[PDB]
Symmetry: D2
Subunit: 447 residues, 4 copies
């Protein structure tokens, strides 16, 4: 109506602010189920699921009803020292129940994934102080890992584009190579050998720093924004092994994988591993209300709550920690996740979608490989297949392919040289077929 | 009603996690207007306004309706590179218009005040890189300043309790003394002389660090969680001037003071000052939906959007940046702020409340002074009025006084040695009188 | 010497044409130095606060030659040593038994000695089971060398501007400088109270459990000869103890008598936990530095658990035999000739004899000192104490004219610094007063 | 007599050793040195197989150097070199060094008293170079695993061996470590020099891309890594280091504290690989240990930028009281005369090759000797528990020290660092002395291997 031509007074995250690029906009006006409609009336399948978070689809009546009911009762009250409200009790019980297998004991709520990560990092340090080991302060993380954009989360991030414009951040953060078969420093194409390489490097890094100086390691069970990097099956079991050997806390960044996208209620659980700390957001409310959560296992909960002196004071949290309306939405969302077995649907429909996309590798030289697990999938676009040289996004080919997919009726997300598929976990087989058709059309014209 | 006895599976921010303290809970079930009700049916005036944020009162029909309407249209969609939706256009236009006097040009939305600060700090760094001065990296802030609990915000915080349990954070953050008449290093009780002292210290710190290494200074127009410290009237003008003398960006943390609590739509505007960056949250949605906002003036917008190479890429933001439902709530909330002149009501009723509390200084030895501006007020409790020695919060006397106020029907917040009053800005004179009576009863019993 | 200069002068502009000029010193004897043209001047700066016994002492030269004949150098790393390092370590721990000094870690200069103090301070807390103790406190205008650690805790900006971000967790306090301080307080006891309260507030802000050490000069040298109130160091010691913080006394300048006592800290009646020594320890004849640790620190590390008892810090030239032999001879002279006492007596005479300059010349704001470290603080306005700007060059012009009058003095910022050998006689003190009177008469 | 030094209480600490009792009670007390032999307080003589600490490169007790020292003490033992003041010897030595390193276009020297100083000076002045150049964002440092660069906080921050870090907490931020091109132990298990180089260079490129070249000030490396275990890089590694640095404008700092002045067979290790760095760090052999001296040299590129720096950026506010020490400079001039007159770089190359060849049979004869590597007269015996797993001996079990102890009784003092026995004798070593080192080591492994 007026959004096509007006000057833009906000900035898009993860994009150029330069004109004329900044003048261009795709304005989404409504969402229903797994389809979204722009201001011109053009409808498209939500192949990006909002931002890997609208996992139950748009406009679920039961979630809207839960929100409205809580607004009528208590939209907001704080949860600071000694004060709380029913919904934060309800959700904390629910989450610790859902993750009893991992022995999760306490939750610290927030409003997003960057919050949940920042919380894990800060509280990991407090765990060690409360335990009498204040020298345990350094953090380990993986190349291509993405953990939000707070200064702590950014410090442990493994992609340079998020660093270049912000100077020196947290010291004592150390990066390990990721077990990425398609691109790794050893050109190692054997998953088991690659795991062995990464674990040896990890041990050598720990030996170099001294285990007694390392607080925690943080990693995504499947690395999302870094390019949907699916680790070898034995990597996470060995991550847990190394952490146990040296007492280091294992932080699973489950912001994307939490609540079913990779085929299991937790990505780490999918690999047969129990972390010490869980970071959750995105799918926890399916995007309806901002919410994040950091969960701590009994080991951590007991140490902090029994800390001497000031070490048991938890001087960290947010005005909106435990927001009643966000909690009410999460409770309704999680009911749907479990009721409709969306982790199982993601595993099944995701496996089909991955298989049906493999012909693209054959047919188009620019498609280096297609990888995924559940309903997170990446098309890794390269200029030639020997060195795996990524296309440069500034040349615009990934965006043009995406544009053509949108014209074919499916919205997908280009991140760097990769096309990311992360649709709602309610995706059906027919809708998966529509995604394949739109993508084949896009590469046919712009590949 | 298992909320009374069940094990608590969440942690309270800003409180002891040790048993038996953590077993105690005040469970708030409902809220309407300026009153809240616990699970036992006990009503109390919300003297803390949630957490300085329920500024229009609880349970406003028009805000609830705006939320429901947006949920029916589009609960959520992203705003990353090239994608947006109607509501974020609407609110960005609204905010830049409200703050046209301050030449605000661009908004980067988030979900809270800690986000808004963290965004300010990171984008301040990027401004200087885009401007060709990547040596500009250090941050200045004030003792007793509070700027959230992300690692960046924590690094510039001016109260030790938020640092003790989390190790070394951001380097290059330097604290200045706050122009606090009641407690300052000069024992200076003249506002004009105190300002001069602080400005001299600031100049000396800049000279020591080198202006060319300093990115920005961040400050609250009235310091909230630090104890409602109202600066001399001429401090913020001089603060603005020294920053400009050296090109340093002035970040106004308006998370509490933004939208009227101190008597003006902006605290900085109330002092006659235009910052380069504004941080907003809390009152922006009156707590109904999590939302934060960081606003940048034309100076900053022009530099970044014209930056060379990668410096115009804004690789910072959050999944819920620009959340449609949060934006819809904000639009409805701001209509009420402006329609009902809540900044004006805060100025008038707050001044009344402040004068009505002064007799407490007379009557009770523990009350060192009572200060405030608008509807943020602090009772500064001391063991000795000559040295102004603060009571120890861990000894519990502030909490015991607060407990008695609750029994009298008014919930107030002890932060350290101070009792904080921060009720909704719709507070009436009658309700202010009720607050005075409850506090008189509390000190009579526990003072 | 009209050739291109292939070395850089520390603490100066490297730009041409400034860099083309040089005062080339060829000879030194007693308290005088002579350039290549025979231009002769009293060494009013004592080299760099270090030629404390004068130039060309036969007994020191002989001690050096004797050690060169026996063993010029051998290492002292794990399990290996040599006679001289035994001798000097015994000598120093004996001289500083009052302070309960137990172990020495030698080096080659003051920056080394500071850097060693900082690193070993960190190790003390790790060995003690408090590895969260990492932050360092220091004073504005403090100078602690130019290694990255020493620079990080320095309190003068000119040493930071060109080197970017260094060590994190270093926090500066205001210095108890009577002539210029944030309280405009010229009363020793009141200024002390102001500074101590500030110190307490910063510790509360950081948390004692995160702070490794505080480092300070008993008299701040390069910062402008700032003599603290008499009760400052006692209360400094007490606040540090209140919180367990290690007190590092940077005695690189004050060590071995310049301020009137064998240690500046001892002169204030204080025992630090760590001593940093250099400059005067060898009177400049051979590079040497020393860091001494009290029984508290030595015992904790030697009983440390795990790896905390491994001292993986030190220098190839730690314990250098020839440097140690030189120090033993130098220290013999310090004690034999009671040079701390001479610095006290003659320094007081010089200080009193300079006071008329304050009255006589508007540019001389004040003259302060203790022993034989003295500063003339030059100002454009005595009401505000506005310092002259050195970039306008008046301090250098005054210094130049002092040189023509036969005395070399050092302009640092707006201050003229006097730090001559501790063998200074009453006549030579008078010569310094005279040369300065001549300089201000023309260039003041 | 030296009797009073036996059993006497030690009031000093040994660097790089346990301070715990009873270990600290043991001491080998050296009483005198002559040529390449040292004598302990019991009268036992041994070849100085460690050359002091890779620094007594011309031998002990050189009359001409002692005379040069005594002569300068009589003339001017010390005077400062700060702003506008200097003395003849610092002119002499600066000219000498810039002349010796004209091939590398070295233009300015900033003197100090040791290798840690020289590294620290390089790091700080690298920072100043970029600020003077208008690029104050260039602040990060790159270095190699197993690299050793002294023990100041800067040098320690870029060090690549954990034992020097464990006890000192967090130091300089923005320091990043790369794997070293170490044939015997590397993440690729690659024993092919060209292939290992390619692996390391690609890792370096990836690290630069991740950080952003515009944030990186300098890379520092040893032409042969000394204390890390005498790791001789592939021949094409340093040429490719220079390439990558040039690709991104990064300053190349050659830590020549050990290799400077001939130990690896060339007056500079970097020159030995055919490379010109931007900054040279020198110490140890520059005075052969007679007087502490270090030097950091800067090429014309750096010198011009700083001397033309705008605002305050041309002020060099870094240096040491003993920078340019007249007596140290006089000693250096006499030492360097000997280095060139006796062609000690050539002797190190020739005798070093002989010694290295003669030691290879030990690999076959003794299971604990994993390999013997070296270049010139820096050589390491890399001790392992068995050649199948290549597991390094753990020094805390004490076998490397026991082997060293046996070598000492056989008449040669050698250095155990971790699992490695280091040989670094004076560069005046003769063929007979090389043979003595082989025999003493043969005896040591026969008894304790
Ligand atoms: C998206 C994401 C985050 C950040 O979540 P926000 O809500 O955008 O702050 C953190 N970690 C991972 C793995 C993510 O995908
Ligand atoms: C409350 C507050 C914040 C943090 O806001 P959150 O929503 O709790 O993250 C930041 N700055 C100030 C001045 C605040 O009062
Ligand atoms: C001169 C000085 C130093 C540095 O000594 P150098 O030998 O120049 O490295 C350190 N601290 C103080 C107080 C000094 O005066
Ligand atoms: C020995 C060494 C140093 C340190 O030299 P010192 O004189 O001990 O300070 C620095 N770098 C390297 C490569 C060294 O071998």
């Amino acid at each position: 109506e007026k959004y096509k031509n007006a000057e833009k007074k906000f900035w898009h995250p993860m994009g150029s602010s330069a004109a004329p690029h900044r003048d261009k906009t795709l304005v989404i006006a409504r969402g229903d189920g797994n389809y979204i409609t722009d201001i011109d009336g053009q409808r498209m399948l939500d192949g990006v699921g909002g931002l890997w978070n609208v996992n139950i689809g748009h406009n679920r009546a039961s979630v809207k009803a839960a929100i409205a009911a809580q607004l009528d009762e208590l939209a907001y009250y704080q949860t600071f020292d000694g004060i709380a409200h029913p919904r934060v009790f309800d959700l904390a019980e629910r989450l610790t129940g859902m993750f009893a297998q991992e022995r999760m004991a306490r939750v610290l709520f927030s409003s997003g994934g960057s919050d949940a990560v920042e919380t894990a990092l800060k509280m990991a340090r407090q765990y060690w102080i409360a335990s009498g080991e204040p020298g345990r302060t350094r953090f380990l993380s993986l190349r291509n890992g993405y953990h939000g954009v707070h200064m702590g989360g950014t410090s442990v991030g493994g992609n340079g584009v998020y660093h270049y414009n912000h100077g020196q951040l947290l010291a004592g953060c150390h990066l390990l190579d990721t077990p990425w078969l398609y691109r790794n420093p050893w050109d190692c194409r054997d998953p088991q050998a690659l795991t062995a390489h990464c674990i040896r490097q990890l041990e050598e890094q720990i030996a170099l720093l001294g285990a007694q100086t390392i607080a925690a390691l943080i990693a995504e069970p499947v690395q999302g924004a870094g390019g949907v990097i699916v680790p070898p099956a034995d990597y996470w079991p060995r991550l847990r092994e190394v952490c146990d050997r040296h007492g280091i806390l294992l932080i699973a960044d489950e912001v994307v994988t939490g609540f079913g996208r990779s085929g299991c209620m937790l990505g780490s659980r999918g690999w047969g591993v129990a972390p010490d700390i869980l970071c959750l957001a995105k799918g926890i409310t399916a995007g309806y209300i901002p919410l994040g959560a950091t969960l701590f296992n009994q080991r951590i909960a007991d140490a902090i709550e029994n800390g001497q002196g000031f070490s048991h004071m938890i001087m960290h949290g947010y005005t909106y920690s435990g927001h009643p309306t966000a909690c009410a939405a999460a409770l309704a969302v999680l009911d749907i996740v479990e009721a409709e077995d969306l982790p199982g649907n993601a595993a099944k429909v995701g496996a089909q979608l991955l298989e049906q996309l493999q012909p693209l590798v054959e047919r188009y030289a620019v498609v280096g490989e297609v990888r995924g697990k559940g309903l997170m999938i990446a098309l890794d676009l390269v200029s030639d297949k020997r060195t795996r040289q990524p296309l440069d996004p500034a040349a615009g080919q990934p965006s043009r392919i995406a544009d053509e997919a949108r014209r074919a009726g499916v919205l997908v997300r280009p991140i760097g040289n990769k096309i990311i598929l992360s649709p709602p976990l309610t995706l059906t087989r027919d809708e998966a077929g529509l995604m394949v058709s739109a993508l084949e059309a896009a590469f046919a014209r712009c590949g």
